[PDB]
Amino acid sequence: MVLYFIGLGLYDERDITVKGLEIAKKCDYVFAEFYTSLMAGTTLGRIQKLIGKEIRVLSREDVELNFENIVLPLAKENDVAFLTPGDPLVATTHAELRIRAKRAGVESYVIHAPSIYSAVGITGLHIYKFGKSATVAYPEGNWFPTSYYDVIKENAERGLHTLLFLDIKAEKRMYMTANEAMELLLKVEDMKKGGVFTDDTLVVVLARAGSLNPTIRAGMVKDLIREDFGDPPHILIVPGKLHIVEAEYLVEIAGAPREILRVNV
């Protein structure tokens, strides 16, 4: 009679941990959500096949408004699993679901999986140097989000790197590309004119982390803004002050212009 929060990882069904698979295989009921992120290398069918169980996919509304009405009731008399892309508690509001579980007298356990938050290490940027993170959200009607711009500014001032999760509208099958994020940021720059994000700003793009051949690119906005980084999901990173080896990796592995090997200490 417990509830398992199990992450499925970055790209495909094989990104789940062995621990997660063995536990998921023995659960009575299996639920999942695929609106918090995109696993571009798999399908519901493949996940079901691997786990050996049928999976009931839930919408944001099902979860946020009815988690305690759909999932928790079953967890009070069975072993239930709730699957999610990447790590279940990273950049989601799922942690609060553990509180709902407690209040309902249901014990819960978390099985982690690879997350985009730590996968950034593949960009060569020292992970400890990342500062506050943010999300580039799609403008809606007259509402144009801009707080993510101030985050970059705050981190840059401290010489820290900025991780930018990109927006997603799963129900509309919309996945923000690094290109779109760059366009939005340039627009905010025109408004705020803080010299935070311009055509000459160095950026790093990581697409489909978790796949065997992810797209890792680095360069100035003007040169990458119209580049094809492949299918989603994508994340955008605005590095702060670079260490020599970070610059070297970006050039040798991310194909950045040799010009960036030159660091301004």
Residues that bind ligand SAH (CB under 6 A): 10-11, 36-37, 85-87, 90-92, 115-118, 165-166, 168, 206-210, 233-235
Structure tokens given for 116? 């985009």
Choose among ligand SAH, its own copies, none what residue 253 binds, the Cβ cut-off being 5 to 8 Å by kind: its own copies
Residues 7-26, one symbol each (x = binds its own copies by CB under 8 A, - = not), give x-xx-xxxxxxxx-xx----
Q: Residue 227: what residue type?
A: E
Distance CA 120, CA 90 (A): 14
Q: Strands 174-175 and 168-169: what pairing?
A: antiparallel
Q: Which residue is nearest to ligand SAH (CB)?
A: 86
Nearer to ligand SAH, 233 or 239 (CB): 233
CB 237 within 8 A of CB 151: no
Q: Residue 69: what residue type?
A: N
Residues 246-265, one symbol each (x = binds its own copies by CB under 8 A, - = not), give x-xx--xx------------
Q: Does 104 bind its own copies (CB under 8 A)?
A: no
Structure tokens given for 51? 């786990």
Closest to 78 (Cα-Cα) out of 2, 168, 158, 183: 2
Positions at the binding site: 10, 87, 90, 115-116, 166, 209, 234
Choose among its own copies, ligand SAH, none what residue 16 binds, the Cβ cut-off being 5 to 8 Å by kind: its own copies
Choose among ligand SAH, its own copies, none what residue 65 binds, the Cβ cut-off being 5 to 8 Å by kind: none
Q: Name the 3-class secondary structure at 129.
A: helix
Q: How far is CA 167 from the centre of its chain?
A: 9
CB 119 within 8 A of CB 210: yes
Residues near 213 by beta carbon (within 8 Å), at least 6 away in sequence: none
Positions at the binding site for S-adenosyl-L-methionine: 10, 87, 90, 115-116, 166, 209, 234
Distance CA 154, CA 160 (A): 9
Nearer to ligand SAH, 127 or 244 (CB): 127
In the complex, minimum distance from the CB of residue 112 to its own copies, in angstroms, rounded to a whole number: 4
In the complex, minimum distance from the CB of residue 160 to its own copies, in angstroms, rounded to a whole number: 6
Q: Does 86 bind its own copies (CB under 8 A)?
A: yes
The DSSP call for residue 10 is S
Residues in 197-226 at the binding interface with its own copies, rule: CB under 8 A: 209-210, 212-213
CA torsion through residues 10, 14, 17, 21, sign: positive
Alpha helices in 116-177 (DSSP H): 116-119, 147-157
Q: Does 153 bind its own copies (CB under 8 A)?
A: no
CB 8 within 8 A of CB 16: yes
Choose among ligand SAH, its own copies, none what residue 235 binds, the Cβ cut-off being 5 to 8 Å by kind: ligand SAH
Q: In the complex, which residues of this chain contact its own copies (CB under 8 A)?
A: 7, 9-10, 12-19, 21-22, 50, 86-96, 98-99, 102-103, 109-115, 117-119, 121-122, 124, 126-135, 154, 158, 160, 165, 209-210, 212-213, 245-246, 248-249, 252-253
